[PDB]
Ligand code: HEM
């Protein structure tokens with residue numbers, strides 16, 4: 023595809039053209055989206071928007087959009103005010119889906135910390151360092167297979183590498199048999215792709231997929247309750263929180279959170295990273311000339327640039343005012359990481375994709391504090407190893423078409439990215 027000029031700011035977007043409540047807005051290209059958030063940061067840093075109407079979802083009240091880095095950081099660090107209960111997407115959750123989506127991410131402390139403590143050891147730096155060889159093995163073989171399977175030197179990066187790598191890693195951590203990885207992939211994509219006609223627009227399919235992955239979780243849990251294995255599902259069924267085992271719905275919700283969180287966002291970080299190296303070849307050249315020296319900053323700049331999670335939602339527990347804006351107890355609040363990560367008052371040259379950027383206190387893993395991404399160290403490893411394997415096996419891998427972008431307010435997804443190599 024065409025490259026662009028690195029450092030170019032987005033087009034001006036008049037504030038009257040911005041409709042965060044319309045699915046059509048989220049189909050526009052990233053230049054327009056980035057320009058819209060730049061206009062909000064400048065002219066309306068806290069503003070109120072209707073909730074997008076999705077067939078079968080509960081619309082409910084609209085939300086206050088926090089677009090400034092400092093406000094997203096403030097909300098994240100004050101959970102006694104900005105609660106993660108009852109949901110962390112904007113749209114209200116049906117009582118039927120609460121059975122499958124009531125994990126620790128929609129809970130406050132103390133119960134959130136008790137739940138997180140069941141699995142946190144498995145994601146600490148020493149424990150993930152052990153997973154590193156498996157990441158290396160899977161990434162090496164996926165890229166080798168891309169080359170063996172495609173003598174025409176053309177393939178889809180998403181289906182051949184970015185998707186399978188994080189999926190295989192988290193499924194093995196969970197104890198899921200390899201035969202079932204494609205069902206997990208499909209379920210993940212329906213749950214986080216709803217509203218995109220290429221994935222699912224029918225709510226019956228969304229509820230069927232939810233029910234099926236919940237039933238799958240429950241059967242695997244029952245098996246592990248009979249026969250322990252060295253995996254996260256056995257951890258879940260063996261835990262006790264003050265002498266009480268987790269309920270079937272708590273187990274199903276934990277399993278679904280871990281599986282979905284563990285593959286989709288990393289997949290999109292890799293695809294956006296390859297697209298950026300394609301658009302800014304100077305950065306590829308710099309990184310390839312010193313891979314290990316630049317990898318720390320390069321991986322962080324890929325996450326800042328991609329912002330794979332566009333926003334997370336909070337709910338006020340009390341009246342507050344910020345920047346002169348009075349917000350009421352019970353109001354929804356949306357935290358726009360995609361905007362915080364272009365905030366001109368926090369980042370020098372925010373429109374420059376600079377793989378040497380340092381410091382880089384981006385909010386791609388959230389604003390910090392109680393819910394800080396459990397998998398951040400694992401994600402950074404998977405990204406660094408995927409790019410090292412591309413450098414080694416197909417260093418000129420480059421996108422040949424513009425991405426097919428996922429239609430989503432929540433996930434900065436790429437459905438397909440055709441690439442070519444020498
Ligand atoms: C580049 C990849 C990733 C990105 C951009 C990302 C982003 C995020 C964000 C924005 C949050 C919410 C943070 C907050 O509310 O303050 C989060 C939470 C979480 N992430 Fe990730 N994540 C990534 C990879 C992973 C991986 C590989 C896993 C492995 C399972 C994972 C597991 C989780 C979990 C379990 C939570 C909920 C934590 C809690 O509620 O305490 N994430 N992530």
Ligand SMILES: Cc1cc(CCC(C)C)ccc1NCNO
Pocket residue numbers: 123125127213214278279282283284285286287288331395397
């Ligand atoms: C994309 C996403 C969605 C959610 C809520 C949706 C359900 C499936 C838990 C939670 C975490 C993440 N990702 C975090 N880390 O990848």
Ligand SMILES: [Cl-]
Pocket residue numbers: 343344345346
């Ligand atoms: Cl103030």
